[PDB]
Every structure is written in structure tokens, then in C-alpha cells.
Amino acid sequence: EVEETLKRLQSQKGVQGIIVVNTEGIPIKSTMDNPTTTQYASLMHSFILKARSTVRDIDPQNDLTFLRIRSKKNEIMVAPDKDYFLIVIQNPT
């Protein structure tokens, strides 16, 4: 299913915006506008590819399955397994 997935992933906290990304970056979906979603998700994809390289450095068998950065202004979410790259815009708290 699609709509139920986003609806449940969103209303759990009244999340500002999430779109489903099953491809490597460049998502055409949108939740609040096309740019702030697409370009930011592409930047996230580029960053997490490097992060995956980083985790593979210490041992190549390692892979990143879960990633969160909680900063003073935003909390960014992504849980990659093979192509499933999450995006979450949410308050730091």
C-alpha cells in the first residue's frame, strides 16, 4: 500500500512532511513543495552514500540500516536497506 503508509508514518507525530522514496535520490514526490523535497532528498542521498562508504571503511561487510541527525533546528531521518531512503522533517524536540 502507499497512502496508508505515508498517512501512518506522518500522523504519528503530525510530521510536517514525508514522501516515499524507493529510488536512489531524485524523488518526484512532494509533500509541501517540489524543490525543498526533491533537492533536499537528493542531497540526503548523496550524503548517505558517503556515510555508507564511511561505515564500510572500518569493515566492508558493515552496512547502514538506520540514520538520524537531531540538531538544534531539525531532526532528519533515513533508514536505507537497498533503495528505501526515508525523509522526515520534524522539530528538534
Partner: protein
């Protein structure tokens, strides 16, 4: 710029592991780690799967003592929407949302976990069709379904259970008609055993609920809506009703054998919650009830022992109050009591594994779990000795 490849990969459903891990992990992400006597513990009320919906059964997973299963009948609110509603609920991190859902085309009457496999969930429905469900896989449909045949169950099934160990398992079910049926977890399409329970002159027993002596397989015990409690051996040298008990005037609703095991043998004690506020305690070797519970009238549904304390149990009243009833300290007044807010028709109560907290169902579907006092939760050798002597009282 892709326009259809993303659309078709969204249309193509390879999201099984995706959704599995995403759900198991996002509720975890709900944690707020930002750098800048009775007592309620967790009140769970699903708005989407429990709006004006009656709790049908409850169970705690021994394999994973944080996982609960709850049922529901058909929803009078909307018939077109799915009727048999089954909820799997968790105690990892707080969240309003149920951890898993499950639907059955028929109204669900009872449900439980399988002891043979720590992931399968088995539930009896209103159509008398046992329903299998795989937790790990992300599906709504029943994985397997027993056939609806004369040999199989055909009347509404209200108690199902798994007996034996993890390599000597057997799934035993009762239909309210009086059919016992033994199935296997590896195949749910043909009764390995089945026979119509009969008391005398070939008349059947309208079994409502059943239980079994802790640590033992076979030699089952059943309660009848006729108001009579029976002991019937599964195979033995002769199957069928083995003993008829004087019993209670109204229908026997919630039956349970004792479960706590310690320095003494009390696996022969039975609690039965009939339709007359009457939580009766007796032993299998005596035909008469040993004691009577009476503080009001009118339907205490179910009674359940605490697996850790030997002389302590719970019973929930349709009036809308759960009282934790102890035997070693008292015989006429509940040692603990509380009422669910809103005074709702509390249906079912379930001691959690290892005890220390309780689960309660409701007519409204708002199931509530909450702990007990430490000074009352933990037993001691004194508890067993004084319980033995209180049995010796009469």
C-alpha cells in the same frame, strides 16, 4: 528526470521488509532524546481498529513477553468495513498505534499465540473456522484456514490453545457445540483428532471455555454454558467427559486452572467465573465448590490466576471494576480493587507472563494494562504454607 520508473516501483509492492523495518523502527524514532495496590501504567485505545468495539479475547506471548493479542467481533458501526478485527499490541516503547493488525472475514471470537512457533498467531472465529496468521510477513489475510466441514469445527469456537512442548506440540480447540479438535501447526486443513464431547445419554456439552492443569498435557477441563463444569480426558484410556461437577447456577464463563508452581502441589485448583458474580474455587478431587466469591450480583466474566503468586488471582466485573482478590490475607474482602474510568463493561482479564502486571479488555475496546504493588506481587514460602493451611481451613 524519471516519471514512471518511480511510479511503477511504488506500484510494484516489494516493500515487505521495507515496511517491516520501517514500522519496527519509526515508533522507536518516536523517542524524545532531544539535547535541548494498583496503579494504571498504559492505557491503549486504538482509534482506527477499536472505535466502539468489544474485546473478545486476550493473550500474552510467552516466547516474547511484551507481545499481546486481542480480538473483536464484527463491527456494528460499519458492516462493509472488515469485520473480524485482530490486534497485536506491544510493550517496547510507548505509542498509541498497534504494532500489528489482522483481519478475518468472520467475526473473531478468541485468539492466542502458538507455543510451537514464536511468530504464528492462531484464532477461533464466530463461524467455527480456526484462522492462522504469520506475524513476520506483512499481510492482512489469514495465512491458513481450517475447512468448514462436519468433521471440523462448525459452531463458533471460543477457546483455543497449544499444549505440549516445542517438539511435542498440539493445537487443541473447542467449538461451543462440544467438538474438541487437535491440529498441528505445520498443517491447518485437517483435524489430527476430533470428537464430540458427550456427558451422558449422548448429549453434548455446550462448552464456553476450557483450561488445563499446569505442567500437564491431556486430562482437560471445560466449562459449560449450562452451568456445569466437567473434567474430560483428551485421550487417556477413554476420551470424553470423565467427571461432572455440582457447579454454579448460571453459565460458566471464565475457567482457569491454577498455574503457580512451588514447594507444594496446587495444580488441581480451579477458578470459575460464572454469570452470578460468583468466582468459585474448588479442587478436581472434590465434587463440591470449596469457596464462593460474593460482593455483588450479575456477571463477573472471567477469572485468572497470577502465575507467580500461588494464592492470588484477578476477576473483572461487568459492572466495570477489576478487583485483585487474594486468599492468604483475606477470604471475604478484595485485597485490591480499581475501576476503569468511564465505568465500562470490562470483558476480559489476562495476567501477563511472570505476572507483576495485568491486562484488561473492555466493551469499548480500550484495553488497559497496569502493574500491581510489589508488596503484593511477590510471594514467599510463607505464602505457600499458609495457602496450604487455608485450604485445610475447610
Amino acid at each position: 528526470l524519471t516519471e514512471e520508473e518511480k511510479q511503477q516501483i511504488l506500484h510494484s509492492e516489494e516493500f515487505l521488509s521495507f515496511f517491516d523495518h520501517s514500522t519496527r523502527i519509526v515508533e522507536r524514532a518516536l523517542s524524545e532524546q532531544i539535547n535541548i495496590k494498583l496503579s494504571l501504567n498504559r492505557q491503549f485505545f486504538d482509534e482506527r481498529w477499536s472505535k466502539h468495539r468489544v474485546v473478545s479475547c486476550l493473550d500474552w506471548s510467552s516466547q516474547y513477553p511484551e507481545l499481546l493479542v486481542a480480538s473483536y467481533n464484527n463491527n456494528e458501526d460499519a458492516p462493509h468495513e472488515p469485520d473480524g478485527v485482530a490486534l497485536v499490541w506491544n510493550m517496547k516503547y510507548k505509542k498509541t498505534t498497534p504494532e500489528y493488525v489482522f483481519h478475518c472475514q468472520s467475526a473473531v471470537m478468541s485468539a492466542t499465540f502458538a507455543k510451537f512457533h514464536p511468530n504464528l498467531v492462531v484464532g477461533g472465529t464466530y463461524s467455527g473456522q480456526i484462522v492462522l496468521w504469520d506475524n513476520r510477513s506483512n499481510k492482512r489475510t489469514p495465512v491458513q484456514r481450517t475447512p468448514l466441514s462436519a468433521a471440523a469445527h462448525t459452531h463458533p469456537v471460543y477457546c483455543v490453545n497449544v499444549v505440549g512442548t516445542q517438539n511435542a506440540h498440539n493445537l487443541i480447540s473447542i467449538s461451543t457445540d462440544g467438538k474438541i479438535c487437535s491440529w498441528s501447526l505445520d498443517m491447518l486443513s485437517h483435524p489430527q483428532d476430533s470428537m464430540e464431547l458427550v456427558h451422558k445419554q449422548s448429549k453434548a456439552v455446550a462448552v464456553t471455555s476450557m483450561s488445563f492443569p499446569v505442567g500437564d498435557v491431556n486430562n482437560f477441563v471445560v466449562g459449560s454454558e449450562e452451568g456445569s463444569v466437567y473434567t474430560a480426558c483428551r485421550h487417556g484410556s477413554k476420551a470424553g467427559i470423565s467427571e461432572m461437577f455440582e457447579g454454579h447456577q448460571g453459565p460458566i464463563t471464565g475457567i482457569h486452572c491454577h498455574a503457580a508452581v512451588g514447594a507444594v502441589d496446587f495444580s488441581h485448583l480451579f477458578v470459575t467465573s460464572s454469570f452470578d458474580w460468583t468466582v468459585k474455587l474448588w479442587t478436581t478431587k472434590n465434587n463440591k465448590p470449596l469457596y464462593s466469591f460474593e460482593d455483588n450480583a450479575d456477571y463477573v466474566y472471567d477469572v485468572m490466576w497470577s502465575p507467580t503468586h500461588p494464592a492470588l488471582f484477578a476477576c473483572v466485573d461487568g459492572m466495570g471494576r477489576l478487583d485483585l482478590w487474594n486468599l492468604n490475607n483475606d477470604t471475604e474482602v478484595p485485597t485490591a480493587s480499581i475501576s476503569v474510568e468511564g465505568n465500562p463493561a470490562l470483558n476480559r482479564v489476562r495476567w501477563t507472563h511472570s505476572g507483576r502486571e495485568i491486562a484488561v479488555g473492555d466493551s469499548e475496546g480500550q484495553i488497559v494494562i497496569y502493574d500491581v504493588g510489589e508488596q503484593i506481587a511477590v510471594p514467599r514460602n510463607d505464602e505457600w504454607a499458609r495457602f496450604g493451611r487455608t485450604l485445610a481451613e475447610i
